[PDB]
Write a protein that binds this ligand. Structure first.
Ligand code: 0YQ
Ligand code: 0YQ
Ligand code: CA
Ligand code: CA
Ligand code: CL
Ligand code: CL
Ligand code: ZN
Ligand code: ZN
Ligand code: ZN
Ligand code: ZN
Lengths: 524, 524
């Protein structure tokens, strides 16, 4: 048999440095995990031991920490080049800074092929970008070749800023003819590498004839065979085996997110490129694996510009930004309003004639707001100030919730009101009125929401059967602070931009801010 | 006697072109008035006839039309230079584009002295600006000299954008020692030329010893001796005679605004510089005086860049901007909200630790909103589109109103509701609730206003005895659409920036707008 070792990462999300166990800032260095220096150590060890290795990224290196804010993708090109990645698929967050912010820092500087078979361009953009990403690449591996075929979420226009000169085609439609074409070119070992989520990954494995292995991302899917090595709970075995429409067994892999694990799959192929066997497991990059000293020293060099940036003025406030718990856990607070207005602003995407914007609504638990910002420092706001408000290294995510689920969340918001608990909700695009003299679970007496499918935004009563888009912290999407109804009842969940970066972008755009408390939340 | 002819303008406010009778756009050319070409004709005729002439401007050439938007003061330097003005005093609107927007276009390019004795600078600004404006200038006139001493409203920090490195001193305090100094220098004929308003002009005439004549502005004061030649109603005789604390009769003049009239005062002096007699009258610059063809042709040349600018994209909207009368005369409309939010934004000035901003409140009659803007032209908004919404050539002014006066205005807003009448009020920083089943004059059931003297802006009930600052159209400050209570009861009124320019600046700053209808006005 001819044996190939596939090493793979996905949704690294700017975790260039080692992190805590939960992927937020490293505090206790001796129990920290991930980061590119440690990844370098483990990839170099595997390349010493195994003759045929590919190192692949399934997209979403962009967006997640101050690294991306400051270096805008140049850190991705530089450090992925240092690790000698073999190929990368485009993820949705690679379009966060528009097509221009992808061509220049990443497409022009990467030393490896960047792939997506289902993205087409038209007009002058088509000539500008031609060949800078590719539908696939054939790579020599020892005395063999392997075809790698890319794909990117069709939902990217709702999740990022690709512009209106790119079209995201159905993945399976776009992929099949490229895989058929590779077969005519005597390429019998084919990896589909892409960024659409585990459910779509399984469909590609099932339906795209001639794919031998699917290496995915986007859904942050953790798969494991055996007892798991950390806190992540497996969604299935690694690899997850799909029985294809042509009768083959096709392994599907993913490796969680944030650079915490290195995916590792060993495939044995026969001479005609059929998969004889597949086995492996993601490797937890914990503190037992040393950081490579050379990469670590380059990281510490690049950190200087970050530390400088962190104390620069982003913008000014002329009002006190009240993120005190005595306000934000008991009533509408103007820090909560600022943060939700920034969330909505970050999620302005290109629209149909059927909506002014696809999302208008925001919720934010008051327990997530961790500091005020005083306006008396000449009004200045810095990244460092925002990091005190939003210290958990979260994201502001897009979900779909039925009205009944949202009413349940608002009842939960006040179920034990008066104890300074974290679940009290700050809001945007929602006007709620509570009557606290009513029994827990029956205290919401009015709940109106801003329309999306309307040319003039205005408020209407919340409808129990209608499904609403809502921007909220990943902590809430995951059921934190007791919002189990959100985790259990949501219809869709996509991970969004870094919390601090959403607020910092909005402050920088506005220049001078003055958020008021204006009646979004009232008590009767 | 030695006879001096003083020609004077004030508060021209960017009326470089001839205007209608009411100072808005010229429609019927053969009955149009003012403009610099016609002014040139009349000044040149007077200079042929009278040997000793000074042509003076008492400030506020800046701000008022698209001329100022595009040329930013370069049009003022150029055309005031072409008319060979002798001196100008700084007005409040000369600081609309900051100190930098006054030094460069105006101070560096004017060929005549620009004066203010009561403005001091500190820090590096003091060295940058030293001698670019002067407390006074001594001018030769025939074989004599005349001293001209400038002054500028002490309220300029609340009316414009002078920055925090300029200090506006009390006028009389600053003026007296400069006038005493001119007397030691054998200058016995002294004109105080300045921009503080007719009431302060009379105080200077009364109290500043040795001033022979006061030439003022800011209050748009029309003075006339005899039957008046147009629609303006005189506030007093021209000149208005003040009996000074040292026993002299001191003439005080002003000449309305907008370039409609040329002030003309003839003074006879004895050999020691005492005023023997004063008489004259503003001259209405009507169509019987021809436009100078050379100046007119230069005006038409400079107009090209205006016409080009008028169709340029200022910014984008992703929502329909509903300025229809069926919305804005019956309920909260999102064009009204946009326009009021722009008004408040235009009136952000440097604040004390005693307020977040000195003004938070806005009213706008729905009859003043004259078009919607469709968002389906790729979202683009142009100046030309804004001119359709706001076609009257007005300003957004600052007034002080007791709460009782404002409650009366809100009752007037709905006194005959249902007829599509113009007085229905759009708002900012105010939340009103009407009950239309109540009798006219008793339909306002809740009226809450955004605080100013607070670090976190929030809403409280309106207090009948408290005096509120409010930004509103000059049409309303003047009692239009039946708001006689505003005209009759207001405590303070200062004229503000051009209506279209306030909105265009705000759109350009925001880049992408999406105003909602959000509950500022409700019916119960
Ligand atoms: O926040 C508290 O009530 C607990 N405290 C109070 C304090 O710090 O003064 C101490 C503490 O240990 N807090 C750190 C962990 N966070 C929380 O306990 C609360 O903070 C919020 N939280 C925590 C983690 C997170 O990722 N997101 C988030 O919103 C939740 O509302 C949660 O209830
Ligand atoms: O506006 C109307 O109801 C009268 N119309 C209706 C229409 O044009 O379809 C005709 C008209 O002659 N209008 C021009 C003059 N303006 C007005 O009559 C109304 O427009 C508003 N107006 C007028 C002049 C002004 O300077 N500011 C201002 O707000 C007032 O609400 C006033 O009631
Ligand atoms: Ca094969
Ligand atoms: Ca004298
Ligand atoms: Cl999925
Ligand atoms: Cl006055
Ligand atoms: Zn991701
Ligand atoms: Zn993704
Ligand atoms: Zn003026
Ligand atoms: Zn003025």
């Amino acid at each position: 048999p001819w044996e190939l070792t596939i090493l793979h990462t996905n949704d690294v999300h700017s975790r260039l440095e080692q992190t805590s166990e939960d992927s937020s800032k490293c505090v206790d260095a001796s129990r920290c995990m991930g980061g590119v220096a440690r990844l370098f150590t483990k990839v170099q060890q595997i390349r010493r031991a195994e003759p045929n290795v590919l190192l692949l990224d399934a997209g979403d290196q962009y967006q997640g920490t101050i690294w991306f804010t400051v270096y805008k993708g140049a850190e991705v090109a530089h450090f992925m080049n240092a690790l000698r990645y073999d190929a990368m698929a485009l993820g949705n967050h690679e379009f966060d800074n528009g097509v221009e912010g992808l061509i220049e820092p990443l497409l022009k500087e990467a030393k490896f092929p960047i792939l997506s078979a289902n993205i087409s361009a038209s007009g002058p953009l088509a000539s500008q970008i031609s060949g800078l990403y590719l539908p696939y690449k054939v790579l020599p591996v020892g005395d063999e070749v392997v075809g790698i075929v890319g794909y990117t979420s069709k939902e990217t226009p709702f999740l990022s800023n690709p512009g209106t000169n790119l079209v995201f085609e159905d993945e399976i439609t776009a992929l099949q003819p490229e895989v058929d074409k590779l077969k005519t070119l005597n390429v019998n070992k084919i990896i589909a590498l892409g960024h659409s989520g585990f459910e779509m990954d399984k469909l590609i494995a099932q339906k795209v004839r001639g794919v031998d292995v699917v290496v995915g991302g986007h859904s942050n899917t953790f798969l494991y065979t055996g007892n798991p090595p950390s806190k992540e709970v497996p969604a299935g075995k690694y690899p997850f085996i799909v029985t294809s429409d042509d009768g083959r067994k096709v392994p599907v892999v993913q490796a969680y997110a944030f650079g915490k694990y290195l995916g590792y799959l060993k495939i044995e192929f026969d001479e005609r490129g059929n998969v004889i066997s597949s086995h492996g497991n993601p490797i937890l990059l914990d503190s037992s694996i040393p950081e490579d000293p050379s990469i670590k020293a380059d990281i510490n060099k690049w950190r200087i510009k970050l530390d400088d940036y962190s104390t620069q003025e982003l913008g000014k406030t002329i009002v006190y930004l009240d993120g005190s718990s005595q306000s934000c856990r008991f009533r509408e607070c103007n820090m909560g309003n600022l943060i939700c207005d920034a969330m909505i602003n970050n999620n302005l995407r290109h629209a149909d004639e059927m909506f002014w914007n696809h999302v208008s609504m925001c919720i934010l638990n008051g327990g997530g707001i961790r500091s005020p910002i005083d306006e008396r420092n000449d009004g200045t706001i810095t990244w460092e100030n925002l990091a005190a408000v939003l210290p958990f290294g979260g994201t502001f995510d897009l979900v779909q919730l039925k009205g009944s689920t949202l009413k349940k969340a608002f009842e939960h918001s006040v179920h034990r009101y008066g104890q300074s608990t974290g679940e009290f909700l700050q809001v945007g695009g929602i006007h709620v009125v509570y009557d606290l003299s009513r029994k827990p679970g029956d205290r919401v007496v009015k709940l109106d929401v801003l329309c999306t499918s309307c040319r003039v935004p205005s408020y209407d009563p919340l409808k129990m059967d209608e499904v609403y888009k809502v921007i909220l912290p990943n902590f809430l999407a995951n059921g934190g602070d007791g919002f189990q109804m959100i985790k259990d009842e949501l219809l869709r969940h996509d991970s969004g931009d870094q919390d601090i970066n959403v607020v910092s972008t909005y402050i920088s755009k506005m220049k001078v801010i003055y958020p008021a408390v204006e009646g979004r939340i009232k008590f009767s």
